Design an enzyme around this catalytic site. Structure first.
Site, PDB file in Angstrom:
ATOM      1  N   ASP A  47       0.823  -1.200   0.000  1.00 11.60           N
ATOM      2  CA  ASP A  47       0.000   0.000   0.000  1.00 11.60           C
ATOM      3  C   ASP A  47       0.860   1.254   0.000  1.00 11.60           C
ATOM      4  OD1 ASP A  47      -2.196   1.658   0.043  1.00 11.60           O
ATOM      5  OD2 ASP A  47      -2.640   1.354   2.167  1.00 11.60           O
ATOM      6  N   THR A  80      -4.649   6.032  -3.061  1.00 15.52           N
ATOM      7  CA  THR A  80      -3.714   7.145  -3.077  1.00 15.52           C
ATOM      8  C   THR A  80      -2.557   6.878  -4.016  1.00 15.52           C
ATOM      9  OG1 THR A  80      -2.355   6.340  -1.260  1.00 15.52           O
ATOM     10  CG2 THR A  80      -4.394   7.451  -0.765  1.00 15.52           C
ATOM     11  N   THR A  81      -2.203   5.597  -4.173  1.00 17.83           N
ATOM     12  CA  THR A  81      -1.387   5.156  -5.295  1.00 17.83           C
ATOM     13  C   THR A  81      -1.941   5.690  -6.605  1.00 17.83           C
ATOM     14  OG1 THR A  81      -2.666   3.110  -5.324  1.00 17.83           O
ATOM     15  CG2 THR A  81      -0.591   3.095  -4.120  1.00 17.83           C
ATOM     16  N   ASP A 379      -7.893  -2.127   5.703  1.00 19.87           N
ATOM     17  CA  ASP A 379      -8.293  -1.383   4.517  1.00 19.87           C
ATOM     18  C   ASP A 379      -9.617  -1.899   3.970  1.00 19.87           C
ATOM     19  OD1 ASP A 379      -7.992   0.666   2.725  1.00 19.87           O
ATOM     20  OD2 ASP A 379      -5.999   0.044   2.051  1.00 19.87           O
TER      21      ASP A 379
END
Ligand SMILES: Nc1ncnc2c1ncn2[C@@H]1O[C@H](COP(=O)(O)OP(=O)(O)O)[C@@H](O)[C@H]1O
Lengths: 508, 483, 485, 497
Positions: A47, A80-81, A379
């Site tokens: 992540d 966010t990647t 997550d």
């Protein structure tokens, strides 16, 4: 005008340098990234959330783009990647036009137009799904799929959704209320279990300590009760001076276990009312069997996360000093039993007076497997919570990006026309998510895209990549889905980030 | 990526030469200037400055392999290096880095079920001393010299066969009192905790004893100070001697008036304890550590049963025995000329007895020495052409990696590896499972391993082919760290 | 030195193999050739790249030289031999790194060559002899994707007449066909349809003032290589010619008109300043003989040859045709048009097709190309590798997969990926033994080459495989290049 | 695979270099370049034709893209700057996908899959205009606007079109046979004239030599007539001039008869001054040093049978001209021969003050009337100023992925590579490179509307009604050439030495 070219070039370089890394990060077929920080520590991380924090960052402006991506991360958890890379290609599509000689403000105006012309598509491409359990199960499956192996995601997609079904108070959802996560090194991984109660750190040490106590109230304490050879010199600097000194400490525990006997002759005149004691520190070796001859479960080594969940969920009134051994300072636990598995003991407190705090107990053979599955669990429950408070749940796997690019290029020169290039620079940089999703799993970046870039109905069809074949696949009937606010705040923050970066000239 | 697997290749290459019964020993002159001429892979791995982070996963997988069977470390390193060496060929062919992962996983899952189908297990029990002495031969046969194992398997087994009782076992009870001097043939067996002492005033046939516990060892005004020190150490040895101790222990050296006191009350003046027995003697007799001579009581005391002097190994030593188990502790006495072979003998002993421990819970024994590896190398490569797709590559690159294990057994024995691998692979087609690689022949000759007796633990291979594949997969799924 | 410079030999071989690796197949990528003067050449044919290239290394010189020997005996495929030798020599070093000798490697390579020559004959489909549909299909298979695609309607006939006019019935039935005796005359002028075939040899020269009893209905030829004079003051040996009385006597030197008349006095016709390619074909069409020594001058002087001499001014040129000849082995093919770049390619590809139809006269077999024969011999040799034991097992299997670059480069330079395509090709080739499927050179798709139709002849691919193997074993035979630096 | 990327990088760089060289020289608002030789000679040039020849080349591969470009110029006359820039931009559009990781054979296929539909659009976008004078006038005006001023284009657009109407025969339209460029350095640039016949080099050096010759019968000669033991040596050369004058008088009384039969004579060398008077006393025009380009035009138009010597002064060795008059203008004279017997060779008389701007207008006239000769030889006419190129983009973007699919990327690469013509036309004319493009890319009809750029306002202007036009064999040949040239440079490998 070469001054503005300097800042534009250095920002383009930094946002490519992050874009390739976070392109390699995204996807269920993605690769982990290992971070070492000075002391030789090893952290296997997929992540981008931990990656943007712990990275010893090379570049100055990359620190700002990582900080604002973290500010986006505060609401979305993941994506966010995809956030920072859709930036790094949005200003790439801008750089394709500032190199042509256009003003940057034109492309900012085009981004401003395309933001509304994408959100008007976003508000209608969604479907206000009812909150059936399976409509959360597939969301948990999608959010768990990109972290761990997909069959393990299909295993733990049941353990996520019932823990999220255990939150049902429609005033405020928070995951940090009730979901506690502990680990058992059983040399097995597929047995992460949700237990409707507080799982403690350890269990009944003595064999004559009772395995089974049903109707249990709890004696909490924090300070010592052990036969304490103190950590300063216990043999203190004849023999008789200490012969009864630490034996006076022994008597201080003798009248104390007499007081414990007194407290369990206050309420436990019946034997159906069992009892459990917990000290956060050690248990005296004669009080161990002295409560085992009374059949009361005893234990040391508690954490404060266990204490706050004893107070909040089990109704345990906390105790510090032993003068107040009184029946009002107890809790309620209708199911206390130790459960030794692997090599370590583990008490389970359940059937408390208000069952709210749960436990997602993780089974894991190694540390990196359990930490990866812990981030997977967290997550997943965060994404399904974001799917709970949003009444709608959008299709995923890059379908809405292709449909939005098929919306924005059909958005005509109804826009300024000079700013039409801004719309066309916003639309092609939306297609990079189905580009790199199919690219990260060995398929063609271009051929799979153009196969999806042929709208398979009269509509721009909600069709994403398949991460096993690289074929146009409708994400609706497969349920590969995600919530609304992830891509909503993604588009909003990435637009304002691109229009922030695009207007810089000279730095000192 | 390629630099990571290159670091894994050199990590495999530095331990490949030390593989098998003819492993070339390495020299360790470490950070604090030791001198080890040793062969065990866990000794070298705990000494080597592993600086590259990708090899640390391989080291940690070998450490986890050590943590549950005690052996098979160099097998994990060689197999993982072989898997990554064929993985770079798969990548440079044009396969993805994803495809090799599930190919290795599918073939490892296939190996995990083919491996219990080749077993020639143990006969009846971990008792019957002469039967299980042959079963413990292979472990020290790999580590120390083979001509030495014929006494050494007996010495390592007759002590460990004392308590194979009631379905539970501990390896910590088998200790070594390393006594220098005479040769390895002069080694013998002892029943109880043993170390050398100094003095002689030992009450021998004690009851459940009362053991002193030490965590820390040792004109007329001058004569008055002398009498004051005299009654001072008198009251000190009385502070132990009150509550009726039978021995007085110390980690250090004797004192003359104190030994006369220990003869006055008839107490055994025990001396010269190590910096490791301070926990171990406390563990066996129920003793709690006491710093000085003044603060013992009856509650602060250990309890042996029989403390006297033994002269086996041609040297006077102590004996602590007959605890709650009545035969819990059983050390061995290892006699050597110098120390530089005795550390290898010591590290062979515990690596024999942990195989005894895994034989308590796993009686399955597979034929070792190329027999199991070539069998898996044939079975999985026959499975490889069955499933089409890209995995048909990777599965066929899995079993070939198994062929790297007898090759490391081949080239460590002066044998042309291609000839003996082809000959073993041919004879395995008809002259089935129990044949493998012979060590002694300079000619590349095969030999049946069952009648040779060279067999290994099934659980060790079962855990090792899991952990090496997990290490290779978790190394293959990284890209880089900024370094 | 030793195996180090043996690896240097095969590195110099691979670096000249993998230069021209891409330029096989119908979608061959071009190359840039640059002399140290600024000139720019763009090419596709690998032999043209092989010509102007310099190489410092002698092993690659010999490797190119033996393919140059291959180039003028059946024709093309000179790139494929250099390609297929390179991967065999590359996979040979993997066992040279196993410290095994080159001898076991080359014996495994020879044992694989013996399976290569047989399994290609197993999958050989017999074509029928001189049947016009399949004779046209030879032109559709071996002449197409060239610049004959707008003029193959002539080349399909120019093949079949020439192969029936270059035969040699020496040890049997017409078996040796030849490239040098088909009397090619490539003169422009007129339309390209004027290119037609005839039996005989045409001569660009004539006697400079043709007042001679010239054309006879059975010209019997005696050759001479001296120069004719006025008379005895040679008319003496011309008088000695009259013992046997031929009707022509062929020289190569000039004859004056009075010496033309004195040659008429014996009635023999000569010719002047001719070429050697005219001379040998004049001798080939007629089977004449040469002698001037008087004790050897016997009844064995006169070569009774043709049936028609003909002075003819075809396109205002001093033509003389020797036709209706004795031997139908030097026969006329004229080639007309405007420029001389495509009918030359017709002559090249039809002399290669002349060797093809020579193979049809020997073994009329057409094997599915496009890597289908390569995949077939690959699978048939991998299954033969399974039973054999010994140290030669790995190199014998190695050329089983070293040679499959003929699909693999062809699937390379067509846009498609190579891994899944080769995996799916062998996936329907191992358990589907009886198919012989080839990768299509157009879309990069695994088709049945027997359905596609592109069949390479048997003997030409046998020659390329044989020459590749004897390239590889010759390069591995070399130990060192020591006679200096 | 790094060798292919290296060869492609060093080729795209060179074809960018040629693109940046011949970008700005396209258009009426373009800039000239200064061809400077080694001897300091200066040449000002707008068209890329002779720019590509005398360019001292700096890069090896950049010669090759030069070599095919003038190979286009043999069969297109003008617009090879457009050819080399659409090559250099087609190559960049392919580089945008090869650097993504695509094989160049896919973009090779997508080139042709768009090229065939581009030809299909070109064969229907044209109008089959009849050979009216006005359509040839606006073809000449369009071809001349990019070389000279629009006012000077209005000067030359009649003097071109009347000569190209004078080449009108059954089936021989030809430029070099009958149209020549005569230049007079006289004080006014607007005075280029069509002359039905020939201009000779000089005129009457004597006032007794007449200026009106009606039945002009022209005599050629090569040997001079000039006054070229020593007092009688040069006098004997003088007597060889004397009996030469007597032989002149012999022809003067041999072929004359009546006074209607005029006689005229030129010489390839000098005429003696007493012989100038002796030819002037009979009023017959003599001439020293006419050019050798005038001899074959005296044959093919004036009917002048050539002669060298004076022994063969014969009646049949003469021409038949209805007008010979000398004409002093500026400083020098020029003899004018008109009303020729088979008057085919004509003369374009360019006037002006300068020399190098007059060579510029000479090359402008050459390019323009070759363009209108192509417009006559083509049986149609096409719109210009990038209208058809925007229409080609509107075709090929909308020409669907019914092609191979992954080659559709190459189709769109060819499509947006065909948009650099109006882009650099707007760039060279001072407007925005993108604003007036998307203004033109707003189709005024429902079809892709034939909208060129206005080269004066930056306005989307329909080129059909204004006649800013070109011939078919320019854009047809660029569509035929550019695609296969760009894919020849795409499928390259590395370099020997
Ligand atoms: N005498 C022998 N003959 C054949 N094989 C042997 C012999 N001794 C040891 N081996 C093989 O060597 C292998 C590796 O053992 P090794 O890795 O040295 O153990 P450890 O991991 O405890 O060092 C074993 O699987 C065993 O089969």
């Amino acid at each position: 005008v070469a001054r503005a070219q300097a800042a534009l070039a250095v920002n383009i370089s930094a946002a490519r340098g992050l874009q390739d890394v976070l392109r390699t990060n995204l996807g269920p077929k993605g690769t982990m990234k290992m971070l070492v920080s000075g002391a030789g520590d090893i952290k296997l991380t997929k992540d981008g959330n931990v990656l943007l924090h712990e990275m010893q960052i090379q570049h100055p402006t990359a620190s700002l783009i990582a900080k604002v991506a973290t500010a986006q991360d505060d609401i979305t958890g993941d994506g966010t990647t995809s956030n920072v890379l859709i930036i790094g290609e949005l200003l790439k599509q801008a750089d394709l036009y500032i190199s042509e000689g256009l003003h940057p403000r034109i492309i900012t105006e085009g981004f401003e137009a395309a933001k509304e012309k994408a959100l008007q598509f976003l508000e209608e491409v969604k479907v206000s799904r009812e909150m059936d359990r399976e409509t959360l199960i597939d969301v948990a499956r999608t959010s768990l799929r990109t972290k761990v192996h997909a069959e393990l995601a299909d295993v733990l997609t049941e353990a996520v959704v019932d823990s999220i079904l255990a939150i049902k108070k429609q005033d405020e959802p928070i995951d940090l209320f009730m979901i506690e996560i502990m680990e058992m090194k059983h040399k097995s991984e597929t047995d992460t279990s949700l237990i409707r109660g507080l799982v403690l750190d350890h269990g009944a040490r003595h064999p004559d300590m009772k395995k089974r106590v049903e109707d249990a109230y709890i004696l909490t304490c924090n300070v010592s009760l052990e036969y304490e050879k103190t950590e300063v010199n216990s043999g203190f600097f004849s023999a008789e001076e200490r012969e009864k000194l630490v034996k006076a400490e022994r008597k201080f525990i003798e009248d104390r276990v007499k007081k414990i006997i007194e407290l369990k002759r206050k309420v436990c005149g019946d034997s159906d009312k069992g009892f459990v004691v917990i000290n956060q520190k050690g248990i005296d070796p004669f009080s161990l069997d002295a409560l085992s001859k009374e059949g009361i479960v005893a234990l040391r080594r508690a954490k404060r996360r266990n204490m706050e969940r004893l107070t909040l969920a089990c109704g345990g009134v906390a105790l510090n000093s032993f003068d107040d051994l009184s029946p009002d300072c107890l809790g309620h636990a209708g199911l206390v039993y130790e459960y030794t598995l692997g090599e370590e003991k583990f008490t389970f407190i359940e059937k408390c007076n208000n069952p709210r705090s749960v436990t997602l107990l993780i089974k894991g053979p190694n540390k990196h497997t359990l930490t990866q599955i812990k981030d997977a669990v967290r997550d997943g429950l965060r994404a399904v919570k974001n799917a709970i408070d949003d009444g709608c749940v959008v299709p995923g796997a890059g379908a809405v990006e292709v449909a939005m690019a098929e919306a924005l290029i059909k958005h005509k020169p109804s826009v300024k026309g000079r700013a039409q290039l801004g719309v066309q620079a916003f639309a092609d940089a939306l297609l990079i998510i189905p580009k790199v999703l199919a690219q990260n799993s060995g398929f063609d970046l271009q051929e799979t895209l153009v196969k999806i870039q042929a709208e398979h109905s009269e509509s721009g069809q909600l069709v994403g990549v398949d991460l096993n074949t690289g074929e146009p696949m409708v994400a609706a009937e497969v349920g590969v889905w995600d919530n609304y606010c992830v891509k909503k705040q993604l588009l909003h923050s990435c637009t304002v980030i691109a229009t922030n970066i695009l207007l810089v000239d000279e730095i000192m | 990526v390629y630099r990571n697997i290159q670091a894994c290749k050199e990590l495999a290459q530095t331990t490949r030469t030390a593989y098998g019964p003819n492993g070339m020993n390495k020299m360790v002159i470490n950070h604090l200037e030791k001198l080890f001429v040793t062969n065990d892979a866990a000794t070298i791995l705990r000494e080597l400055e592993v600086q590259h982070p990708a090899a640390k996963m391989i080291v940690m997988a070998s450490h986890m392999q050590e943590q549950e069977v005690g052996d098979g470390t160099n097998f994990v390193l060689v197999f993982a290096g072989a898997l990554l060496e064929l993985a770079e060929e798969l990548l440079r062919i044009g396969l993805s880095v994803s495809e090799v992962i599930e190919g290795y996983e599918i073939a490892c899952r296939k190996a995990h079920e083919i491996l219990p189908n080749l077993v020639c297990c143990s006969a009846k029990n971990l008792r019957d001393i002469d039967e299980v002495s042959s079963l413990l031969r292979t472990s020290i046969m790999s580590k120390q010299y083979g001509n030495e194992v014929f006494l050494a398997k007996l010495i390592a087994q007759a002590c460990v066969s004392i308590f194979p009782d009631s379905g539970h076992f501990n390896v910590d009870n088998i200790r070594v009192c390393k006594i220098l001097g005479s040769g390895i043939s002069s080694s013998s067996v002892l029943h109880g905790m043993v170390f050398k002492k100094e003095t002689e005033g030992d009450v021998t046939s004690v009851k459940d004893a009362k053991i002193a516990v030490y965590s820390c060892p040792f004109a007329e005004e001058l004569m008055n100070f002398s009498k004051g020190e005299e009654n001072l150490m008198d009251a000190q040895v009385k502070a132990i001697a009150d509550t009726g101790a039978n021995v007085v222990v110390t980690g250090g050296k004797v004192a003359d008036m104190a030994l006369h006191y220990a003869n006055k009350y008839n107490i055994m003046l025990v001396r010269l304890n190590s910096k490791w027995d301070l926990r171990r003697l406390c563990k066996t007799v129920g003793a709690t550590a006491l710093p000085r001579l003044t603060p013992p009581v009856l509650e602060e005391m250990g309890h042996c049963d029989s403390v006297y002097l033994s002269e086996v190994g041609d040297t006077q030593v102590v004996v602590f025995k007959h605890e709650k188990e009545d035969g819990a502790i059983s050390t061995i006495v290892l006699r050597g000329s110098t120390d530089n072979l005795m550390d290898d003998i010591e590290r062979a002993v515990d690596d024999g007895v942990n195989t005894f421990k895994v034989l308590t819970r796993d009686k399955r024994l597979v034929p070792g020495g190329g027999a199991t590896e070539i069998e898996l190398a044939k079975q999985i490569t026959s499975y490889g052409e069955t499933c089409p797709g890209l995995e048909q590559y990777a599965i066929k690159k899995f079993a070939e990696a198994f062929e790297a294990i007898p090759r490391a057994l081949a080239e460590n024995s002066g044998v042309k590896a291609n000839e003996v691998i082809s000959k073993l692979y041919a004879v395995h087609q008809e002259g089935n499972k129990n044949v493998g690689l012979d060590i002694e022949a300079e000619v590349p000759a095969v030999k049946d391993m069952l009648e040779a007796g060279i067999l290994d633990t099934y659980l060790g291979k079962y855990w090792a082919i899991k952990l090496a594949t997990n290490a290779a997969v978790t190394v293959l799924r990284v890209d880089q760290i900024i370094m | 030195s030793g195996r180090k410079v043996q690896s240097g030999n095969i590195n110099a071989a691979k670096t000249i193999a993998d230069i021209i690796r891409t330029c096989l197949g119908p979608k061959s990528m071009m190359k840039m050739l640059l002399d140290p003067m600024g000139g720019i050449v763009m090419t596709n044919d690998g032999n043209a790249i092989l010509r102007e290239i310099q190489v410092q290394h002698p092993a690659a010189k010999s490797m190119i030289e033996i393919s140059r020997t291959q180039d003028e005996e059946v024709g093309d495929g000179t790139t494929s031999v250099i390609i297929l030798a390179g991967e065999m020599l590359s996979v040979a070093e993997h066992f040279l790194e196993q410290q095994m000798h080159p001898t076991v490697v080359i014996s495994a390579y020879r044992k694989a060559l013996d399976d290569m020559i047989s399994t290609l004959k197993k999958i050989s489909i017999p074509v029928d002899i001189s049947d016009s549909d399949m004779m046209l299909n030879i032109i559709n298979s071996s002449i197409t994707t060239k610049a004959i695609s707008r003029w193959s309607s002539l080349a399909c006939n120019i093949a079949l007449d020439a192969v029936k006019m270059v035969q040699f019935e020496e040890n049997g039935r017409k078996e040796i066909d030849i490239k040098k005796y088909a009397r090619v005359e490539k003169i422009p002028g007129g339309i390209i349809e004027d290119s037609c075939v005839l039996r005989g040899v045409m001569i660009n020269k004539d006697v400079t003032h043709p007042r001679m009893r010239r054309y006879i209905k059975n010209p019997r030829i005696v050759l001479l290589d001296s120069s004719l004079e006025y008379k005895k003051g040679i008319q003496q040996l011309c008088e000695d010619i009259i013992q046997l009385k031929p009707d022509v006597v062929i020289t190569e030197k000039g004859i004056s008109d009075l010496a033309q008349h004195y040659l008429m006095r014996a009635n023999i016709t000569a010719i002047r300043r001719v070429r050697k390619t005219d001379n040998n074909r004049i001798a080939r069409a007629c089977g004449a003989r040469i002698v001037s020594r008087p004790e050897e001058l016997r009844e064995d002087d006169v070569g009774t040859g043709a049936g028609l001499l003909e002075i003819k001014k075809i396109g205002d040129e001093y033509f003389t045709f020797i036709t209706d000849c004795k031997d139908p082995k030097a026969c006329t093919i004229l080639l007309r048009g405007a420029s001389k770049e495509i009918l030359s390619e017709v002559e090249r590809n039809l002399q290669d097709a002349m060797q093809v139809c020579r193979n049809v006269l020997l073994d009329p077999q057409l094997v599915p190309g496009g890597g289908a024969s390569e995949m077939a011999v690959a699978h048939a040799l991998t299954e033969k590798s399974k039973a054999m034991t010994g140290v030669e097992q790995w190199p014998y299997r190695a050329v089983a997969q070293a040679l499959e670059v003929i699909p693999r480069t062809l699937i390379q330079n067509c846009g498609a990926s190579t891994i899944r395509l080769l995996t799916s090709l062998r996936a329907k080739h191992t358990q589907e033994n009886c198919e012989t499927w080839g990768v299509n050179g157009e879309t990069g798709t695994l088709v049945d080459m027997k359905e596609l139709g592109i069949w390479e002849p048997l003997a030409v691919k046998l020659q390329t495989y044989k020459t590749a193997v004897e390239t590889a074993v010759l390069l591995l035979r070399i130990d060192d290049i020591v006679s200096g630096h």
